[PDB]
Design a protein around this nucleic acid. Structure first.
Lengths: 112, 119, 68, 66, 100, 55, 96
RNA sequence: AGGAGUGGAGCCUGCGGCUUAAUUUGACUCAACACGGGAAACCUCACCCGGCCCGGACACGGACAGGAUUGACAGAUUGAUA
RNA sequence: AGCGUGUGCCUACCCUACGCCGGCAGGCGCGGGUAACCCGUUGAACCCCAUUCGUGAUGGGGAUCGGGGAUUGCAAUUAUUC
């Protein structure tokens, strides 16, 4: 439900998945995505929005869940990163053939 | 010809009898039904049929009191009343002679039309 | 599409212009003659007035009835 | 002769209120009376007996097929 | 003093790495340790139809979800275990320390 | 009143009480291990929950 | 949607004091699980917040069966102008 | 080569037909017919016969605080303390 | 015997030993278990052994149908189930 919600919210922001570490006293939940500067917002506005969301929805206590937003190293070999890439290229108004070769050319040069 | 009785009990003997004593007389389904407790939900529509029960005007057949209630028990208290059993479409004019006691008003209504066969 | 029975209307609210003057009676002096009964319920102290129907009294929101 | 009430083919009878075993010629009489009782009151059960159909709540679509 | 660590995990190699670190964590600090008891692994099972409608040949998927439980007993003081168990855990494993 | 009729019919049991926690629909529900999640949703999210096809 | 005014003020105070508010798509929920003691039904929360959405004050994201409402800068100005709040104080998402 | 059958009997059940206010409906050779995880008393429910509610955002123009609107026990009325 | 399941988010609804009442379905007490801990050493059926039966639609078969008794539920009549 976390991963679905973060897919619907952070799609255009270059989303690539979650990793949740259920530690004592804290929940070290790490968003792995391409653009860290886009997901975090303006001086960490959208970090704190997403913590407040996850807090109020899943019934975590006051600040016992804190989010990070780390960077995808070699994002050409992440599947859902290149899926959403192709998704927002087509939705942007680009032609189907050019977009697909564009993704395929990038993920080949990325070293796949 | 003869004076009709339920189980081994005359109608006036049935009629001035408590619910707790009337339980031990009719079948186990109706014991269960009326033992669950007095009816306070939209089953206080059963309690509102008790008001339509207590509206027999002077000497004739009383007017039709209608029901979307097919799970209602035909109590001896009820007998003589003119009831409209809802099929879902139509209110069937049903009188209740004293041999209906125990049964449900809904069963007496056909509900579904009989099925002759064209081909 | 076309139906058989003629339509059912909604209850139109019989709105009254200046409905406050009826509840009191003004005196020649600076006093009052309160016509309609005040609600003895706990929710509304002595501000809310009861209805003055032809054969009993009633209050709206506390839903309290008094027959003669 | 101390046979219990739970053991008889007519328990808590509708007309006399007595627990009694009913035997051949009486049983045929009491079955006729039970169908005739349900018939006269015009109950759904008695009506299904009158029409020669399944009464205890079967599906008549595919079975009953005489 | 008799402290009972319950290691429950979905993965085995992550659970075997954690219980191996807690034997090394009990051998280096020289506290008496009853070995890691392998509990009978529980295979959570869901068998659905593959078809979102009803209109194919009746194929079935059969989703397992193995959950492995270990448990380790230590003859250790409380604050020594608080130090050991807080170090080097990996997120697959769930650790429940019983005091007594 | 309308508030006495709006939600007064019981929703205590039956497949008109519990529903999918994604679809919100009333059919093919996996109640086992408190999934409470229709069979098409589970088949979508199996991988994400920890359910794996092996045998 | 016609609401008791005290409810709508309680919802807007809760939307402001924290930078976000969430709710389940459940019209038949007599008490909102957070804003509980101030007796608001969930449908009053849904219909208040989609009224905030329509005139472009709050941002809508919907997952599985849960609405999520992010309060945006126009919504900030509308609520401090509406509730008569000081412009000194911020929602809990603008504070670090 | 055989084994156990099925097709025959009863019933359970699904489908066509008939019927019906409605008998909700998808799928009809293998690859429709105990299939829709579909064993439906209500709910499910989509069908039929009735009756409630707006859960018609927002924008615009009127009505309007001299009150726009909410709700409401009787007695009728209704199936109903809708 | 061997796979399992078992007290829930909203969600009420768990699996049950043991002791009394009842023929039975079942009821009332009190326990244990969020489980290799309790139900559970899962005292399962077929099978195994000893009676009755005797080629008869028979003690094969248990459809249909009458009367009664309990449980689930807000409600069982178009028989819920037993």
């Amino acid at each position: 439900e976390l991963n679905e919600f973060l897919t619907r919210e952070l799609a255009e922001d270059g989303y690539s998945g979650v990793e949740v570490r259920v530690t004592p006293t804290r929940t070290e939940i790490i968003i792995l995505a391409t653009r860290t500067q886009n997901v975090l917002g303006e001086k960490g506005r959208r970090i704190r929005e997403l913590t407040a969301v996850v807090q109020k929805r899943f019934g975590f206590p006051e600040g016992s869940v804190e989010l990070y937003a780390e960077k995808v190293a070699t994002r050409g070999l992440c599947a859902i990163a290149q899926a959403e890439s192709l998704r927002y290229k087509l939705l942007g108004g680009l032609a189907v053939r050019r977009a697909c070769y564009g993704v395929l050319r990038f993920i080949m040069e990325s070293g796949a | 010809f003869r004076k009709f009785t339920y189980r081994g009990v005359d109608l006036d003997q049935l009629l001035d009898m408590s619910y707790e004593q009337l339980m031990q007389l009719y079948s186990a389904r109706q014991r269960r039904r009326l033992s669950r407790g007095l009816r306070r939900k939209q089953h206080s529509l059963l309690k509102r049929l008790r008001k339509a029960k207590k509206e027999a005007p002077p000497m004739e057949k009383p007017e039709v009191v209608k029901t979307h209630l097919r799970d209602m028990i035909i109590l001896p208290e009820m007998v003589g009343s003119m009831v409209g059993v809802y099929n879902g479409k139509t209110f069937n004019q049903v009188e209740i002679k004293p041999e209906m006691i125990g049964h449900y008003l809904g069963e007496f209504s056909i509900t579904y039309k009989p099925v002759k066969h064209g081909r | 599409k076309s139906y058989t029975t003629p339509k059912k209307n909604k209850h139109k609210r019989k709105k009254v212009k200046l409905a406050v003057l009826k509840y009191y009676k003004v005196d020649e002096n600076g006093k009052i003659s309160r016509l309609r009964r005040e609600c003895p319920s706990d929710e509304c102290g002595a501000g809310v007035f009861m209805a003055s129907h032809f054969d009993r009294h009633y209050c709206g929101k506390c839903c309290l009835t008094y027959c003669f | 002769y101390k046979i219990p009430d739970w053991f008889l083919n007519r328990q808590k009878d509708v007309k006399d209120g007595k627990y009694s075993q009913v035997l051949a010629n009486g049983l045929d009489n009491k079955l006729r009376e039970d169908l005739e009782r349900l018939k006269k009151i015009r109950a759904h059960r008695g009506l299904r007996h009158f029409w020669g159909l399944r009464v205890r709540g079967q599906h008549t679509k595919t079975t009953g097929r005489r | 003093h008799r402290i009972r660590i319950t290691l429950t995990s979905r993965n085995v190699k992550s659970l075997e790495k954690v219980c191996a670190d807690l034997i090394r964590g009990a051998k280096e600090k020289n506290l008496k340790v009853k070995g890691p008891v392998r509990m009978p692994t529980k295979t959570l099972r869901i068998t659905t139809r593959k078809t979102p409608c009803g209109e194919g040949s009746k194929t079935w998927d059969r989703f397992q979800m193995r959950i492995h439980k270990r448990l380790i007993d230590l003859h250790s003081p409380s604050e020594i275990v608080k130090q050991i168990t807080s170090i080097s855990i990996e997120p697959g494993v769930e650790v429940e320390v019983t005091i007594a | 009143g309308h508030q006495q009729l709006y939600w007064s019919h019981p929703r205590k049991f039956g497949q008109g009480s519990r529903s999918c926690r994604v679809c919100s629909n009333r059919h093919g529900l996996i109640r086992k291990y408190g999934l409470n999640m229709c069979r098409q949703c589970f088949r979508q999210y199996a991988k994400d929950i920890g359910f794996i096809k092996l045998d | 949607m016609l609401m008791p005014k005290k409810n709508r003020i309680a919802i807007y105070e809760l939307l402001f004091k924290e930078g976000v508010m969430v709710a389940k798509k459940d019209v038949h929920m007599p008490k909102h699980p957070e804003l509980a003691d101030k007796n608001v039904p969930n449908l009053h929360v849904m219909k208040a917040m989609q009224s905030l959405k329509s005139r472009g004050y709050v941002k809508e994201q919907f997952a599985w069966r849960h609405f999520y409402w992010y309060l945006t800068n126009e919504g900030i100005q509308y609520l401090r102008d509406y509730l008569h709040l000081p412009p000194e104080i911020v929602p809990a998402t603008l504070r670090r």
